[PDB]
Amino acid sequence: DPPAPLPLVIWHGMGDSCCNPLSMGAIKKMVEKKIPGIHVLSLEIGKTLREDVENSFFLNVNSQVTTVCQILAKDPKLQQGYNAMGFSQGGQFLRAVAQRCPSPPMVNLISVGGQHQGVFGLPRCPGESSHICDFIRKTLNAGAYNKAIQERLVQAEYWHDPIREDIYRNHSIFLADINQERGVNESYKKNLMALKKFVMVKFLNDTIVDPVDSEWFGFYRSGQAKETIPLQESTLYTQDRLGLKAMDKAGQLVFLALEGDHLQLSEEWFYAHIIPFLE
Ligand SMILES: *[C@H]1O[C@H](CO)[C@@H](O[C@@H]2O[C@H](CO)[C@@H](O)[C@H](O)[C@H]2NC(C)=O)[C@H](O)[C@H]1NC(C)=O
Numbered sequence: 001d002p003p004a005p006l007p008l009v010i011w012h013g014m015g016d017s018c019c020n021p022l023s024m025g026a027i028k029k030m031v032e033k034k035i036p037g038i039h040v041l042s043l044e045i046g047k048t049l050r051e052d053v054e055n056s057f058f059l060n061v062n063s064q065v066t067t068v069c070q071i072l073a074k075d076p077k078l079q080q081g082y083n084a085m086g087f088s089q090g091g092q093f094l095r096a097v098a099q100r101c102p103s104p105p106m107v108n109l110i111s112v113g114g115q116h117q118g119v120f121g122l123p124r125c126p127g128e129s130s131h132i133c134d135f136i137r138k139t140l141n142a143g144a145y146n147k148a149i150q151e152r153l154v155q156a157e158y159w160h161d162p163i164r165e166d167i168y169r170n171h172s173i174f175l176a177d178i179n180q181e182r183g184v185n186e187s188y189k190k191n192l193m194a195l196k197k198f199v200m201v202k203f204l205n206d207t208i209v210d211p212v213d214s215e216w217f218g219f220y221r222s223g224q225a226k227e228t229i230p231l232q233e234s235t236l237y238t239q240d241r242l243g244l245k246a247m248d249k250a251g252q253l254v255f256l257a258l259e260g261d262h263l264q265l266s267e268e269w270f271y272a273h274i275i276p277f278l279e
């Protein structure tokens with residue numbers, strides 16, 4: 001029957017598209033090889049690869065989501081449930097879909113290098129040993145939350161300032177929302193717990209995502225930008241505002257980690273660790 005082959009929904013990262021033979025096109029190919037007959041839907045946000053790639057930089061994420069929710073709803077092969085896999089920012093995005101639109105029901109969710117607590121630093125510009133790097137990021141929180149900037153810059157929508165965190169909570173239009181920052185969204189929690197498995201992949205030697213901990217839902221300790229604490233030690237988990245504590249107890253959260261920089265993995269590893277979560 002069609003059950004066994006649960007469809008897979010893919011969402012590419014920043015700067016990439018749905019159908020590039022080298023990256024997303026190659027993933028879709030591998031999956032199909034090991035799981036004969038599987039329906040794979042690789043999201044394309046926009047009518048052209050042209051606007052797909054740019055919308056990943058310049059299109060309101062809250063809009064991208066409702067739009068994706070609409071696509072999934074008109075695909076008949078997904079009404080009995082589907083699995084989902086997001087690369088880089090696509091991780092948080094698919095997570096947003098899970099909390100915002102429970103129908104069709106997402107089943108397992110694989111986050112490949114996603115930033116679930118956002119970011120606070122620029123790619124390969126560690127603020128520990130550079131006045132410039134540290135300067136810049138700290139001199140952006142001053143604007144990243146302007147309504148005009150938030151509604152036009154995708155990256156700004158998941159920029160998370162640990163220092164002046166009060167402004168991040170009250171002004172971020174995406175991350176703050178799906179992370180229950182303003183107030184606990186009851187459906188959000190119920191919808192996230194409805195997932196069966198939430199796999200979080202983390203690239204140990206990552207130099208693009210600052211902090212790397214964000215890949216496992218961790219982040220810098222409040223008030224500063226030097227040290228970081230894990231998910232288990234954050235209030236989001238302490239008060240279980242999202243249901244991650246209940247999921248963790250029930251074995252719904254899986255944490256994988258490997259060596260390499262951002263989105264750097266081999267076929268071997270993929271076939272070994274990810275394939276099992278799709279079939
Ligand atoms: C590549 O980098 C990663 C992370 O930067 C290394 O993994 C661990 O990183 C932590 C923190 O830097 C160290 O305390 C551990 O000792 C590292 N693991 C081990 C076993 O050494 C990883 O080791 C680095 N290896 C490569 C590919 O250069």
Ligand SMILES: *[C@H]1O[C@H](CO)[C@@H](O)[C@H](O)[C@H]1NC(C)=O
Nearest residue numbers: 164165166167168169170171
């Ligand atoms: C954000 O909104 C809250 C609402 O309770 C308000 O108390 C707080 O002062 C605001 N934070 C800032 C500094 O924007």
Ligand SMILES: *[C@H]1O[C@H](CO)[C@@H](O)[C@H](O)[C@H]1NC(C)=O
Nearest residue numbers: 099100184185186187188189
């Ligand atoms: C989730 O929380 C409740 C539903 O139980 C509702 O007040 C809130 O608007 C929901 N969030 C959204 C916008 O889906």
